[PDB]
Amino acid sequence: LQSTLDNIQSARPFDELTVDDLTKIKPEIDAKVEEMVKKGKWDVPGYKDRFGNLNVM
């Protein structure tokens, strides 16, 4: 845990973050994306549940 805490502090993409970086460190990203395209639902709660969702309407 000491080591993991250090790993979060000295390397962390958060002042520049591309979906390529999250896809690269976690293929869980692409797995979930693919499952959602397969699901045929393009609403995912997780985008609007803390991250914004301003909309014209």
Partner 1 sequence: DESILLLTFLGFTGLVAKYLAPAYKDFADARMKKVSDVLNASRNKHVEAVKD
Partner 2 sequence: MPQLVPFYFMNQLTYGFLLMITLLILFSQFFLPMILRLYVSRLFISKL
Partner 3 sequence: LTTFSLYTIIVLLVITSLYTLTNNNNKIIGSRWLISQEAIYDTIMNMTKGQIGGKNWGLYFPMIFTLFMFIFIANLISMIPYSFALSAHLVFIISLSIVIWLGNTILGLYKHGWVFFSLFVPAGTPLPLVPLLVIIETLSYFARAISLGLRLGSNILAGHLLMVILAGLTFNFMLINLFTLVFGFVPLAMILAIMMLEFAIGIIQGYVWAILTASYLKDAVYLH
3 interface partner picked from partner 3, partner 2, partner 1, none, CB below 5 to 8 A per type: none
| DSSP single-letter state for residue 13 | -
CB 29 within 8 A of CB 23: yes
10 belongs to the binding site for partner 3 (CB under 8 A): no
User: Residue 47's closest CA among 19, 20, 8?
Assistant: 19
User: Residue 32's closest CA among 14, 13, 47?
Assistant: 47
Contact residues: partner 2, CB under 8 A: 19, 22-23, 26, 28-29, 32-33, 36-37, 42, 44-47, 49-51
Contact residues: partner 1, CB under 8 A: 1, 4-5, 8-9, 12, 14, 17, 50-52, 54
